[model samples]
Target: GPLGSKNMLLEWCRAMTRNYEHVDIQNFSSSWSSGMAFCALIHKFFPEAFDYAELDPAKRRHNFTLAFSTAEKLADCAQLLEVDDMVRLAVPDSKCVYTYIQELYRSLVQKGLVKTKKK
Candidate 1:
């Protein structure tokens, strides 16, 4: 049912004021995969500042896929984010962690799992 595991979905908070903001989730190192780089981005930037806040609050879904692919991406992302915790968790085969996180993503977006504030 999944093309891959779920992503570590990020929900953005509105800017401190009305000033519109934009975040660039770019590849820190050209050697790393850009695809995965975004994975790490969704991890760090959300639940805080992000463009999704510009969207209807009801549609701001945290979309992350925890799949072997995601794990591999996370590894690449760690290098970019420079996070020791993620690096430590990545060692000794990051695939397991990736899949584990994926399962969490799956549960998050599952039918009816997401709640609507106005519903």
Candidate 2:
């Protein structure tokens, strides 16, 4: 039997975004291309920042902009991924999305919104 922390993080992502519509986070690449996953994750923690229900999945650029800016302002998370680069790709780079997620997770932890253990 074996387990890994990475898997836990991925599972956490899946669990956190399970309730949000228009977000299907199977992997960090295409799953996040629309940027709805990012907004969902942040919205789960910071509901006051924006209304998730009003977001349109087709508006990729707007989704990315809202998520990045809201995360930066509320959580002190840096804007790691560029909106232009993200919107241009059908599937965003997994590594890039993963890195940003890690940063977002760290910010959330710092805010005491997320527990280190599986959630």
Candidate 3:
């Protein structure tokens, strides 16, 4: 299945195989500005997703994609993720990420997308 151009998107994953490549990408950013940015952002994904939309438009914007979402998504991500404690993501919705991860991992393994010794 070539996506318009053959093997372009597949090529990028090939770029990061041999190295742990620990790029610290803003792991913990709890600024109000980031929160405001999150507020402006969540409306695009989950409008009226807040428990109460009337409490300040700027803060309400954070209700979906920023405030609770990071922790929630991190919790969502902690499903297939290795974490700091004995934990699990037992919810049905979180299973979706695991399913996609497995599917993509299998596909890349099948696609000759890595340089590792193991098949």
- What TM-score would each prediction reach against the true structure? 0.24, 0.87, 0.23
Query: What TM-score would you give candidate 1 relative to the actual structure?
Result: 0.24
The candidate that wins on lDDT is 2
* 11-32: candidate 1 lDDT, tens digit per residue: 2111211232333322122212
User: Order of all candidates by lDDT, from best down to worst?
Assistant: 2, 3, 1
TM-score winner? 2
Off by over 4 Å in 3: 1-92
> What are the lDDT scores of the predictions, listed in order?
0.32, 0.80, 0.33
1-119 in candidate 3: lDDT tens per residue? 56632144233333332221221212112122223323332232334544323434334333424434543443232233222111132122324323433444454456554334665
Model 3 clash pairs are 39-61, 39-62
> Ranking under TM-score, best-scoring first?
2, 1, 3
Over 1-119, each residue of candidate 2 has an lDDT whose tens digit, in order, gives 12964576688888877687667778778777777888888888888999988888887778888888888888888777888878877688777777788877887887777874675
Estimate candidate 1's alpha-carbon lDDT, on a 0 to 1 scale: 0.32
Comparison by lDDT, 1 against 2, better one: 2
